[PDB]
From Swiss-Prot:
Gene that encodes the chain: CINP
Residues in coiled coil: 51-85
Function comment: Component of the DNA replication complex, which interacts with two kinases, CDK2 and CDC7, thereby providing a functional and physical link between CDK2 and CDC7 during firing of the origins of replication. Regulates ATR-mediated checkpoint signaling in response to DNA damage. Part of the 55LCC heterohexameric ATPase complex which is chromatin-associated and promotes replisome proteostasis to maintain replication fork progression and genome stability. Required for replication fork progression, sister chromatid cohesion, and chromosome stability.
Residues with the Phosphoserine modification: S47, S51
Domain of life: Eukaryota
This protein's record includes keyword Phosphoprotein: yes
PANTHER family attached to this UniProt entry: CYCLIN-DEPENDENT KINASE 2-INTERACTING PROTEIN
Subcellular location: Nucleus
Name recorded for this polypeptide: Cyclin-dependent kinase 2-interacting protein
Length: 188
């Protein structure tokens, strides 16, 4: 049916947006990891006069590079924000498909599944759960990015850096929810 093709395409769209998210998150981690390491080197600053002079000049250039890296990290957040808005579109699309099915074919309890077993509303419930997770993850990343650029403790930097990569909200069950949609719709 037409709705089946739309739902299968919607699941594929979720896969592609989640891939773009991971691509940007990995790139952001590289940037965030460069900020942390330069910060720790800058924070590590009765030695020889040559060493003092050298350390002084090197640390001035650390500050310049750190400012460029922080702007680079903000650009990644901008890319992730664009993805999160596209995800809200995808969740809204799933919702609209459910509304189209109800109007054209009546009560869902009396319609057959589009594929194997899922009622069409279950696609929306899963889609909305994914949106909710990435909403929370994006909010957390702005705090992480803010802390990285201002924190002065190496250990905190590592903890925040670990949060950026592990993604406590997305890592919980993003894969399982996505996989269940791809499995039901017959994707690879």
């Amino acid at each position: 049916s037409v709705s089946a093709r739309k739902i299968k395409d919607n699941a594929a769209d979720w896969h592609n947006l989640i891939l773009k998210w991971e691509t940007l998150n990995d790139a952001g981690f590289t940037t965030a990891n460069n900020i942390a390491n330069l910060k720790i080197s800058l924070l590590n600053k009765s030695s020889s006069p040559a060493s003092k002079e050298n350390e002084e000049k090197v640390c001035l250039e650390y500050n310049e590079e750190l400012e460029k890296l922080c702007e680079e990290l903000q650009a990644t957040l901008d890319g992730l924000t664009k993805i999160q808005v596209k995800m809200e579109k995808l969740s809204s699309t799933t919702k609209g498909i459910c509304e189209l099915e109800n109007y054209h074919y009546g009560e869902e309890s009396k319609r057959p599944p589009l594929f194997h077993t899922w009622p069409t509303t279950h696609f929306y419930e899963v889609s909305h759960k994914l949106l909710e997770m990435y909403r929370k993850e994006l909010l957390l990343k702005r705090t992480v990015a803010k802390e990285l650029a201002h924190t002065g403790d190496p250990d905190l930097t590592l903890s925040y850096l670990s949060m950026w990569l592990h993604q406590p909200y997305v890592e919980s069950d993003s894969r399982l929810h996505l996989e269940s949609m791809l499995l039901e719709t017959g994707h690879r």
